[PDB]
Amino acid sequence: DLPSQKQVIELLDGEFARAGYEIDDVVVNAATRPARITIVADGDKGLDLDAVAMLSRLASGLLDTVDTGDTPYVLEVTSPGVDRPLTTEKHFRRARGRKAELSLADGSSLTARLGGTDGDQVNVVVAQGKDFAVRQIPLREITKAVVQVEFSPPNRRELELAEQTGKGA
Prior knowledge:
Elements: H1 5-18, E1 22-29, E2 35-42, H2 49-64, E3 73-78, H3 89-94, E4 99-104, E5 109-118, E6 121-128, E7 131-138, E8 142-147, H4 156-163
Parallel strand pairs: 2-3
Antiparallel strand pairs: 1-2, 4-5, 4-8, 5-6, 6-7
PDB class: ribosomal protein
Keywords: rimP Mycobacterium Smegmatis, ribosomal protein
Assembly: monomeric
């Protein structure tokens, strides 16, 4: 059949990196006519149309080296999307379960999946080895919070924790 997400990534990651680009995610969708393989990539300087086309050429060339069989697919290389910034406690509540990039007041940053709010805290869920940590961060320590677009579905255990912690609308 079609290669797994992991197969596409092992196939492309090195070449993409060698071209100066990072692979953020890969989606092999076999539920459309025809199937779509989506590569989500980025560089320090985003993806302009030149880069999108170059990486599409790269990726398609590399994927032709693979036995797809009689199964027909379409390839797309895209930038990671943009999603809402969050300002109020209500916003955080509504964004429970979403992945977020948080800038902290001490200058550090953190990518984590948002849990519920709890008093003046927000719960966050972070991967830690094969397991997870649930941390509370005070709203007054978050100076920027941006929800990320997700292409592959969230890790099931991670989403379970993020969605059954604290309050969220």
